[PDB]
């Protein structure tokens, strides 16, 4: 019962960067429901 | 579900994810200054 020569992967840059890109992004999303909303308003 | 995540010192996102940043963090910069402006004029 030998074993089959199963390939493996790396983690690098994939949930160590992206915490910050959490920032970013977040208030992108955060900012455009917002200010749309706060914007629309003040029309 | 033998896989597992791991974390490792190692070089990467360099200046390639790093395209995708400015989309986040330029975002941020210029909402901070355009959505101050814009609030701020507001009342």
């Known amino acids: 019962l030998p074993a089959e ?3 493996v992967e790396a983690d690098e ?3 160590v960067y992206a915490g ?3 920032y970013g992004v977040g208030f992108f ?3 455009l429901v ?3 909303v706060t914007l629309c308003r003040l029309r």
Chains 1, 2 share one sequence.
């Open 5 to 7: 020569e199963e390939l």
């Open 29 to 31: 999303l955060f900012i």
């Open 13 to 15: 840059a994939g949930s």
């Open 34 to 36: 917002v200010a749309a």
């Open 20 to 22: 910050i890109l959490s």
